[PDB]
UniProtKB/Swiss-Prot annotation, chains A, B, C, D, E, F, G, H, I, J, K, L, M, N, O, P, Q, R, S, T, U, V, W:
Belongs to the SctF family. Its main location: secreted. One of its GO terms (molecular function) is identical protein binding. Changing R57L: Non-invasive phenotype. It comes from Salmonella typhimurium (strain LT2 / SGSC1412 / ATCC 700720). It holds the Pfam family T3SS_needle_F. GO terms for cellular component: cell surface; extracellular region; type III protein secretion system complex. This is SPI-1 type 3 secretion system needle filament protein. InterPro entries: T3SS_needle-like (IPR021123), T3SS_needle-like_sf (IPR037203), T3SS_needle_YscF (IPR011841).
């Protein structure tokens, strides 16, 4: 059995499945950096991964909110 | 055999047969919406069907009452 | 054997037999409505049946009285 | 034995059973968030669940009121 | 022994017995709401019960008056 | 000993004994209503009792007068 | 000595004595509100008292008129 | 002795006694805030109390008016 | 055979057929974006499509409701 | 051969022939409306036809009764 | 030959001929808008036409009903 | 040659010649009304003419009968 | 030559000549409004004229009927 | 021949003719900018024209709606 | 010569002459604004004039209707 | 010289001279009303005068007939 | 000399003299309002005066008619 | 010395002395009401007194006439 | 001498005297603000006074109308 | 002669006369700045004047709208 | 004597008295800073005081408006 | 005994108890930093704690307001 | 066949076609730079192309959003 999942959850899940391994990649990059904060290759890899993570979080949240605000209008036209 | 049916019942039945499937359509639309209250297509379809249902009920009741009030006048001219 | 039955009773019986099942129909409609006073189909059916019942009672009474008042005139011309 | 339940209650129950586990999901999401208000995954999950909850409450209330206002018209045509 | 009870009282009693527990349900719903006026589940339950109560009172009164006005006509045809 | 009582009084008494407790019931209903004019149960009970009282008074008076007017004709045929 | 007082006056007086202090209560509530039209407690108290006053006036007038119209029928059966 | 108190007053009093100390709590919260308008704990406590107060006032007024409008209908069926 | 379809449904269908492929276009744009949330071309295309979708939903709902509120007036002039 | 037809029937027939096609027009208008209860043109046409039908029925009945009551006076001057 | 047409129909026709092409104009405006819901010129033109249509329908219905209610009074002065 | 004509016929003829054209006027007014039962000018003209016709018929019949009953007394004094 | 005209016609004519041009004024006002149903000056002028027309028709009919009912009493005192 | 044009259309046309060439100016400014998005003179000219266009659209729509809402009130005073 | 003018027209004319030049002022203000929709002085002047126009139209219509509804009561006391 | 005048004429003349100017007053009141059917002062004055006129006509006719029927009895005791 | 004045005129005059200056007060209030339809003090004063005027007219007319209908009964007991 | 007084006068006097002060009470109630037509206490008192006055007048007249018609029969049995 | 003043005027005057100086206070606050629209103390004082003024006007008007609608009911129970 | 000017115009004029020369001051400040956009004294003076202008425009518009919305409420209490 | 002061003024005064000397403190801090804009101690003190002033103004205004919007709801439940 | 605590307070308390010691931790961190503003370990610890505090306050306030705005909608569907 | 394309897409396409080859130019410039990151000519060319790309993306997005926000206002004026 699968717990309930609506449209906004389906959009969030589409984002979280299009960007599949980025969470583990960022965790591993920080784990490697924290043991040698001076290697320039590690610094560059970490910068790239952190930037991708930031952009993905912001886009996901904005899309979810825009769809919710599109929904909550139609409903107020029921009266 | 058919049970008794007069003129006001014939008017009500004319409405209920000109608007043939709307009851089942509204039931199915609500059944589909209640399982995913966020899909905008479902919300729009439900709004349209609910509005049609409302207009049809109001028109039917007003017509029945106007014909009854036309009838109940002639009769009081029997004395 | 059949108990006595005159002309005004024959007119009343003609009405009560032309409108054959309406009494039972109204009773059943009220029985169904009183258990769910919110179903619009039940409300519409009950309105139609109650209107038919009202019109039939009024017409029957007016016709009986008009025939009685036609009768009670001829008689007073016996003297 | 089952306590009494009419048409508006049946509509409310259709909503509350089409959206089956959302109440418990929102409670659990808040319980998890309140212990670590900084995890972005928790923040995103909580935002999605709160939006779904809001949309479902608003739709349910509007539908109930529209059906009640459809009912309370037919009745005033009994006089 | 049972006190006297006529036809209009029998109609009122048919309504009050088809809608059997609604009075106690409304009382309990208000008792629960008045102690926490912010719980949305309590607010929704109270709205549904109050709407059912309103519709039932209005229908009962209109039916009683229509039957009384049907009665008080026949009688004035006794003269 | 019983005071004198004729046929029209016997008809009036037949009505007043077929409708046995309605006078006391109406008095008690008004006594209860006048102390809380807002309770809907009291309002409904009072409406029903007042309607029954009205119908019973009108029927009694019409029957008494019709029998008196039947009597006062035969007598004028004594000359 | 007491001035004359009939049945309709006795009904009016039964209402005006079952609702004993409401007139003074409404006067005092308005006197308190007019000096600070912004206190929500005063606004709520005034709303409740004004509603009770309205319901009591309407019920009293309707009952008086129904009893008068019951009376003025019997009398026209004296001829 | 207790001054007069009807049904709408009893409903208002049920609300005002289910929400027992909120008035004093809001007064004390404002008294504490006005002496240091910058403490975030005081700001949060005041926001919560003000929101509860608002919801309770609105619910009380709407319930009182709905019951009054249910009452004032039955009465107009006395004629 | 074609299921029933009235005037408000015909207006909704006129909108949904004048804007023919936008639903599939938005779905495909989100499917492409969720796999690479950083490509500026994808971001721009998605922004444009989401804006068009929003405007079309709002216009459709407002037009349907205005026509329904034009209809439900004429009907109340039948009495 | 033509069945018997007197003066009141001639007046009724003058009305029913001055208003020649209105019955069929009303039937056709209702037949068209019952299949699409939302078209404002159909609603307006139906309102106009129903109003004309009502006025014509009332005028016909009043004229017939006034002529009958003019007749039934002369006759009682034969004695 | 021209089908029958009375006074209320003549008033309706005076409105429908003073406002000659508005129906076709509104149809064409919606046809153009539904193919590009974003052009501000189309949006403005559609808003203006929809407002004119609404005002014209409301005025027509109110005038027809006022004339019908002026008529149906004179007639009841025939008795 | 003129057929026989006595005193009561001379009185009837005096009425029918003092009111010279009213019969044709009433016929023409009904002929005009039956073709447009909604024109208020036609309704007013018809009401006035019908009232004049009624008053004239009643006065004529009463005068004829009073003169006949004055005559039939003198004769019974011949014995 | 002037066709016959009695007292009720003279009263109707006194009304129709004291209110001399109102019919043409109302016709012209409707003719102007039907070509531009949105001009507020036209709407105000039409409202005023329609109200005057309504009041004048009602007063005329009531006066005519009161005078006719004053007449038809004296006559029945001829026997 | 000129197609129909009412008061709200005349107001819209007054705006669209007082602001005569702005549409073409904005189109030409965008056409010039899209070929060299870096020239500061082009950027400034485009900003000014876009701001004027925005203000003019908003003012036009608000004025049209205010006049329509002034109109639709007078009409509801016809009953 | 002056065309006919009654009491409701005299009230409308009292309003339209107490507010003497406002129509021309509003027309001129819109004419000036439509040529430069950005001048804040013009915007402020137009807002003030539009508000005055709205208030004056609403007050005029309400007063006319209240006087008409005061009139149409007295008349129905002629019978 | 004075034309002949008997006892019933003397009674009629006593009424017509006790109520001296009422005929002219009613004529003048109608003359003033027919020129402005909306002035409430004129409506009230006309209602009062019309009621007085009605009561006076009815009383006069009843008294004349009662005296005539007292006379025509004594005479039949001459044989 | 004083023109004739009966009992119903004396009742009307008692009302019109107990409410002595209200007519002039209402005229002056409208004269002041029509020159500045926006002053809230003027609006409040006008509302109060218009309400008093309405109540006084209705009470006067109802009392006059009740006394006339009490009179016109006694008279019909002269035969 | 006391002027002559027979049996019907004794019955009238029994009524007028059983209802002793009602005339003065009604006069005083109208005197108080005419100076403030808006006080609800005055309105209620006046309604009660007017109803009592009406019932008493009707009963008195009917009883007097019934006794007179009982008398005038015995006498015609002297021949 | 004091001009006439009834019950609704007394209620309005009770409000206008419980809120004694607020009109002058608001006038002075606006006079001070218009000369320096930037002082925050002046802005705060003006906001408070404007809010009090608004609440007081709304409460006064609602109370006056509720009392008028309580009055205008009792009166219609005079017939 | 002075053109018409109501209450909202008087409020706008009070603002525009309390802030007497600010328009010319802002115009002159911009005229001086546009010829030397680098002088810090000119920049500071322009910033101050632009801020004052902004605050004054916003305050004026908000006050006008609040007074208009206070007015347009009282009026809707005329019915 | 103390000028009038309501509830919103009492809330504003509670804020302005809980924050007692802040206005003078800010004035003195600016007076000291403007004479030596470089002393870091003066800069820090001024920053702290300006921040406190800002927070206090914002909190005061928001609380006043929330209480006003709580009030203006209850009142609209008087009808 | 525990003072009253509703749903929004329960949500606030869930946040304040999931984040249990953060207030004391921030206070202690600032106490330690203010005595040596140069230790980088203290600076880093203080930055982390201040960021956590900020995020927790913002999340708490937003959640409380969203739940309050979900509540205050259902309630307005009671009418 | 061409897939659907609305107004915002047409604006985006106007930008993307006025800036025709910049995407390929930037790609080629980066491809050349990544193979020799030290050539100053390559560095300068890459800087210029990257700056143009940035400006073009920002301008496109801002224009699209401004047009969408102009559109979504007009629509909300449909109600």
């Amino acid at each position: 059995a699968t717990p309930w999942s609506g449209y906004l959850d389906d959009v969030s899940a589409k984002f979280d499945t299009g960007v599949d391994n980025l969470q583990t990649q960022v965790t591993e990059a920080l784990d490697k950096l924290a043991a040698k904060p001076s290697d320039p290759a590690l610094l560059a890899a970490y910068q790239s991964k952190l930037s991708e993570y930031n952009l993905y979080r912001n886009a996901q949240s904005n899309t979810v909110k825009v769809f919710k605000d599109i929904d909550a209008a139609i409903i107020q036209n029921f009266r």
